[PDB]
Amino acid sequence: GFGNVGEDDLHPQIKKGAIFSPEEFDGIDKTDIFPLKKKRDPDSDHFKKTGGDDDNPFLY
Amino acid sequence: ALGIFSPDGRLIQVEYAQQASEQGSLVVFSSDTNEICLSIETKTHNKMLIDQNKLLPVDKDLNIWYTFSGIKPDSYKVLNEARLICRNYKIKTGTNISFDELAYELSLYKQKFTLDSSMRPFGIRSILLQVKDMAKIYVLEPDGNYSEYKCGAVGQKSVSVCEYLEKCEEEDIIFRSVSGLGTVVQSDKNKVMSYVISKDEIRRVEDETVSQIISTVSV
Amino acid sequence: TTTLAFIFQGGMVIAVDSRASAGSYIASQNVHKVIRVNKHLIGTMAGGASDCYFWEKKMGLYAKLYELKNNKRISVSAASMYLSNCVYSYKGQGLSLGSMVCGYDGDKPVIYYVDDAGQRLSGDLFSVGSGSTIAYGVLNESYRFDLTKEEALNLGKKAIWHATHRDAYSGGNVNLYFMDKNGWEHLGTFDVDKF
Amino acid sequence: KFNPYEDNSGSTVSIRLNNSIIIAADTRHCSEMGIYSRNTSKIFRIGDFLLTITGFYADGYELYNRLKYQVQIYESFNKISIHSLANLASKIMYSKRLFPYYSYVTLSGFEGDNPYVYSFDCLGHFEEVDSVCNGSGSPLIQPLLDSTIEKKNWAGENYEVTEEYVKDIVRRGFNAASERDVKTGDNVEIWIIKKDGMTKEYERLRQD
Amino acid sequence: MFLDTHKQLTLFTSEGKLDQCDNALKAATQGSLSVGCVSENGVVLASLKESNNLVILSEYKKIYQISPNLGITYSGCQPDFRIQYNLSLKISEEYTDIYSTNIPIRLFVEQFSRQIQEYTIKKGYRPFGTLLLIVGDNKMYRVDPSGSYTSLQVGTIGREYTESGRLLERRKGMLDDNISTCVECIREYCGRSVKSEDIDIGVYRGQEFRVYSKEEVQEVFDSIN
Amino acid sequence: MKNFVIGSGVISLRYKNGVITCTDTQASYGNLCKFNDVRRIFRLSSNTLISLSGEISDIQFLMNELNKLNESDPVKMSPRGYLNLVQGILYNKRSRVEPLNVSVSIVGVDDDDFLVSCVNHLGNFYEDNIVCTGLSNMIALPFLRTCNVLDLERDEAISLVEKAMTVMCYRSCRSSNRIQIGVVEKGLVDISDPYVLNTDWQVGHNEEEIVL
Amino acid sequence: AILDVDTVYTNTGDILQIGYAQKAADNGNTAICMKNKKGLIMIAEKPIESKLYVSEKNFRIKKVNNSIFQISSGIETDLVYINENLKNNLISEKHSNDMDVSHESVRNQIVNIIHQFTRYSGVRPIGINLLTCSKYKNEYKILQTDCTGKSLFFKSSVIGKGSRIVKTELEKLNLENMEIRDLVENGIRILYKSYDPLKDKPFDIEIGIMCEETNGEFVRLEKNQYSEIIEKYK
Amino acid sequence: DYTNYIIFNPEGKIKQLEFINNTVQLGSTVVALKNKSFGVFVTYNEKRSKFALQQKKIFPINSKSLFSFSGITNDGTKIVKYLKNSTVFENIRKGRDIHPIHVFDDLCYSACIRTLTNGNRLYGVQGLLLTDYQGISLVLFDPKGSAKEVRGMSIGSRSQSCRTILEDECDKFEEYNKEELVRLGIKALRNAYPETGVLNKDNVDIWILETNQESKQIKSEEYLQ
Amino acid sequence: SSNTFTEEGRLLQTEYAIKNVSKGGTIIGLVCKDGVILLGINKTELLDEREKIYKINPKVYVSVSGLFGDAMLLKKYGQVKAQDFLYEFDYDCDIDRICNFISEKKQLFTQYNSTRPFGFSFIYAGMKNNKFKLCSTDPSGTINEWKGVCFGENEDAINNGLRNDFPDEEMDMERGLFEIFKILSKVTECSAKDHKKYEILYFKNEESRFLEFEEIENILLRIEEEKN
Amino acid sequence: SIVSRQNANTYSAEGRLYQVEYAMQAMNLGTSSIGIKTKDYVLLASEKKIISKLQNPSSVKKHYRVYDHIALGFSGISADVKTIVDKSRNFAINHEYLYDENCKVERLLEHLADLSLNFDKKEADEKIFSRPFGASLLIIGYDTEPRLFSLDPSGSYLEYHAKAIGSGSEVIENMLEQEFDPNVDINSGLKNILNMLSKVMKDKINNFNVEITAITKNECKILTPEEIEQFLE
């Protein structure tokens, strides 16, 4: 809840600094393929399996 | 009417509680820098009745003692709250409660029952007593007032005892307390006890001396 | 951060680093990590800047309330116990805190290391913060109870300087205090680059 | 899973001089991957004091409303000092430590003759600063102020600091941020708080 | 002044008596007569039902069952008895939940009497105006508005209680004949000729209490006549 | 945060002496177009319109609260009054970590002052001459901004919004061609009956496919 | 001793405090409500206690919702509480069902909110007569409520001190196929017929109509609409 | 019997609601005049003793809004705080200014609650709210829970003479200018206070409010000396 | 009235509650060398169940006089509190703790304005510091320790007899009960005339027992013969 | 209870609440005290209520330190004054907590006045008692100016240049209107206030039956008996 703000500034670590930092709320030049968050390629368009039984797979 | 003013500006129930606290067995005390002498008188009409000890300890390591005059059952609750205040203060703060803080909190407890409806004032004059660094005696009114007393008396006909103590400025506080008690009580009707509170220690005085000194007053 | 407090024959020394970090970015370089609550009681704040400052200022208000209705200075034990209780009420909620509530109870110096876990220790030498381990090393081989005041101050000043020398989250000015029976005194705001 | 916060660009800079306070902020309101608006003001005023926010714009607006409500309650007797207002802001912010305002508030104003600028974090800690930048562009602008205004690492004789020089430095820093900061805005507000009054200017920034 | 909801309606008089408790006892004493007779083989419990107001006597009941082994009947105002009956059912069901057995007579009477007495100290509340006869476990208990209970061999509540109680002493016997004996006893205290519709009878035999059906009460009266 | 039945997009822009708001009437449950007559443009007053998008249940709840507030107090409200009220409601819901999965656009005119505002599920809000909600914000808004709407008359503004909604239908899964247009001017508030846009789809015809 | 210390029964079964409340209510300013297939109107006396009051902006008619409005006589401040609670209950009821509150539901709310004042001890009877006009399923009904909470639907009703004279005139009146302006005319005429100048101060008229010409919305007529009628009957 | 608490007397009136009318007459006079374009507050303040500072009976709720009251000053301060809070809420959460009459809706509901039930204390304060809302509007709030718009009013001790002086000229307020309204207010005070010397440059504070303009206190030198 | 003071400075309601006790059945107590006698006088033959003397815990017994409903309420309360003490500290409490529980509740009820005092008195038989003890609690809540005491009908007469007719000689509880019967008969013949209403407990801290009316009649013949 | 609350809140036919009228009689049934304000200093002198000489003079103090620069004197029922003092201290510390400054004395007076007539409110911190406090208070402090405030049980308060409370209030006021001049030095002011006090004291004025508090821009001084000795002559 309190966010452990300052743990790194409080302990020797044998990044929680004393002041809360922005966006607390990789080494590759990636950029994005679409403005949509995770989308990269067309959606998998097929009728998707639902129902049946997953916790009793072998009781056909 | 309860917890409210009267037409003449009087807290009627509070003064009735004061009077009820006056109709109690007389207690007399006197103190010097290093000691207090506390004397209590009790009715001996019943031989089968075993007299209770009226000097009860509030906290034994702080050497705080408690005495009262008035409605006895209320004294039980007030003493319980004194002990609870000491213990809770040590739990919360980690250090012993000072005598003045204990007096203030006990006076607040006393006042609590006079600020509200549906509840009745304690109606007991309660005495807090301590000898750790110096003699100190607090007399707490049923309405929450409290102030230190060098010497005094409380209970049945205690005003005359205080008036006598005003003049009886004798160095020996045992003399002062026992003689002040003797101004009212009757040796045949009243059994008397006397205690000397010293540095973290307590003891009661011999019956012979107290009776002898009491006999010389109100002859 | 690296804070330091210890007791020696002549009194008590307190020293802090005054850097404030927000990750890799150094948000501030001159933050004050000592909360003065009265002339005979101060507290070195380590950990979250807001929560540590907030509860210390909430403790400084309790000390003033105690003084008003007792006409008497609050003891260090009561001041630190009040602080530890407040953070202990939030134990396990991620509250990050660590501070030495130090002062004089009459003629006796006492330092209470209070911690977010509700811990409360009285001792003669404490160091808190990321650079505490470096400070502990410099103090271990040099700290003595028989230090003179100048030796003790330089030891505290130098111990913090070494920690800032070697710790990323420690730097800025070495704030230095000397707490005594007659109250504390802010002995300087020395900049580590000018030693 | 619910994310209660949004980042709405940063780049607010406040510098206190000897006799004036220069506080500037970009006017862009940013979504993820997009620009909600190019004319949203990050700077609010409370009497003779200027408040500026960065981060979640709704949180800053709510905090400003809380401050204004508490200040107008307090003002039943006297005007609130900048120090009292900063302390009240810190208390208000910390009251939400379990659900913090995502706002880097910077409160600046004059206490009589003396300028004061207070910088806050999301959890309420406040300190009196000489120049502070909040938000996304803070790492791109703060070193510029440390070097040119505060003269850190300036071993030789220092160029005298003045209002016209500091405003030039501020516009230079905002140009640099808007160049290398994706979310720094299209126009920059520049307020100049002086002893007896305050005034606002505008400049256009990179708009792509 | 308007009604003080916080007022204590039950207080000691200057003579040491509780003013309102005695009035509640008077209210209970005015109720319809009901009797109980203990025997070496069991306990009988009988009460009279008023036929006025076109009450369906076949459906209206005066003797009630709390548990398989306990029965109860009252003299006084009906609403207070209905509330006390809800309370007693709660008590017995709670005991059965905990221990799984039928509540013993004495434990039930104690737990019930304490909650009855609650209202002699409850602010703004008056005591129940009902006397209760509780029959079970080969014993009888009379419970009064004060919350005071007494085990009895022969007991009466309602009108003509003292003289009926004296008559019950003259009308004891074996349980099988005790039913008719006590029906004769209470036939002396009814304003009109008693039909089987006008009387309820509950008898504790062995290990359970059961209330006679209207047809059984006819059989008891056929023995009477 | 409810994500069951979602309305797709809201487009509202201000033009010469007026304001537009437009939404499709489709409501989707996942990939299923469950309803095609769910109407999300409402009249808040004689000079205000509110269009909503997001979870339909949250839309209905929010409009129910707004209607209660409208019938309760005896004092009229300007469009900015409704903007403040809705922003407060949504921000309170967000701060109680029980947010409404709804984003709305309040548009209205008061004494020749024109309001075009947006409020998202978090209580964040802004005002601009063109505000779009949802995937409209990325698809239709860049296209709408290319036209200086401030100098358009009502017919040109309506045509531009219809073109934007046609682009949304082409390039959005959850957007249909059956739109509803709400217009507010100084002395007019109008919400048209939903009508169907006319599409082309002629680009993929190719040369040698028998058009059927 | 009379047991009027509180809302309790006397030995004859009468609740005296409710009688006193009815005495207070019966001395208020008169309001007349007349209902017809074509619409509903209510007239309200507004005595000129002093010329300093802006009578044209002080309203006796209080709206419960868009379809229910009411007026009271007696201690008219009690209508503040009654109206606030009725509004809170009925707005929520209407919008939680997305349909108008029916006349019977309004009557239920009125009776249940007014009864608790005649039912508890530390409480004071409402002390007002209350007229509640409502529209539901394209029908209009007037609900006249007494201090006891007893509320009945009427074709036309009056409250206030001049009720005794107004009621007979209403009984002489036929409402079927009367235009709304005919209702206004008759209401003003009957109100002035009960003026009794020597005992009551001069008054202004507040008229609120609810008819088809306004699709059933409550409309407070401005003085210029009936100044001619007031001049005719002054 | 009927004097002490909230109940109808046999004649059908509540005596406490009449006593609050005497209560609201305790404070010093406030005289208020309104014109469509501007409004005036005139007050008489007397130092309670030679060494007491003036109590500043007039309180500005917001720029272009003034409030003043007579009676128990604690209730008046409560109402001042209530109006300030309502101004803040209405400006922020509703994007508008306080409505002169409807801003008092919650306060009127609370006052009605107090007049309907015992235990709660009746408000002993009568207030005047002069605010610019589509023009200058003046509102009189009464402790019974009703706020009514007025052309001009006088509250406080001896306010009936001021009220009649104002009422003799009410129809001409829409034609008077600001100096004329101030003169009429001072005339009303003079009629209430014909004793010379009592009204002076120090005892009278005049507040001016003009539509679309801030409220200002103006010197009383030009009107009394 | 209620629980409030008066010009005289006394709680009249508590005084009336105390007066109520004297109308109850007589109960007596006496501390002896080897135990405590607890005696009670019922109004009817009651071998079915004990009604005047009860048990709180293995080493505390109480006699009852006054309002039976309140008496049983606070008896159950005291038993529950004794069991709570055993739950807390894993051993049974002494007489003082039960006295404290009941006195605290009684004082609460004589201090609360909207309630009435409990109209009954208890006599507690128990041990403390390895010596027998005999306490008492009035409706006011005061705790009185006694060598011997009486409550109920003939309370004043029996108390006076104990004051000035009971020998000061320490005696085992057999002679203690003999002397109790002596003074009781001297006060009133009805005590020596009938014995089937008596409940008498020979409290020994570990082995307390009740006396059969055959034992009571064995005491009766001794008292009848000693005077002849 | 509803009946007791109604008894508290009943108005008199003349106006003022009955309980307020009774509290205003109770408020002056105590020892006298004088407060003097001058543009340099504010004084507050009170005679101690020494019921008996066995009661030591030190422990019957009548001035309470409300905050760093606020002192509170009182007359009337002294029991209520410790509750008032505790709540005043809480208010002052809360004000510093919110705003990091010493509150204006007027702000404390406003808070206490608001809390006064809140008998009915169910939360302790939002009221003083269930009745008016039977004490009259003279609250002095420094808030960029020496301030003297009097708070009555009615909840009303006024800023004063000089006031006297207690049984000698009227006499001391009739003497103040002749003797008081604010253009006087602090030491001569102390002499004048002690002279005025001695007129009403039951016994002879000395440095042990008198308590004096003087608050100035420099210090919130409480005078020791060895210092009152300087001004008694």
XYZ file of C-alpha atoms in Angstrom, chain A residues 14-37:
24
model
C 22.772 -6.401 0.512
C 14.324 1.608 -7.554
C 12.788 2.991 -4.357
C 14.441 6.340 -3.774
C 13.604 8.766 -0.997
C 11.317 10.739 -3.340
C 8.524 9.148 -5.347
C 9.368 9.100 -9.047
C 7.287 9.527 -12.224
C 5.804 6.479 -13.980
C 6.027 4.505 -10.767
C 2.300 4.956 -11.143
C 14.937 -2.159 -22.361
C 18.246 -1.508 -24.098
C 16.781 -1.909 -27.590
C 15.586 0.727 -30.072
C 12.165 -0.857 -30.395
C 9.467 1.699 -31.211
C 5.961 0.406 -31.981
C 4.291 -1.153 -35.007
C 0.796 0.159 -34.179
C -0.515 2.713 -31.668
C -2.509 -0.133 -30.125
C -0.682 -1.318 -27.028
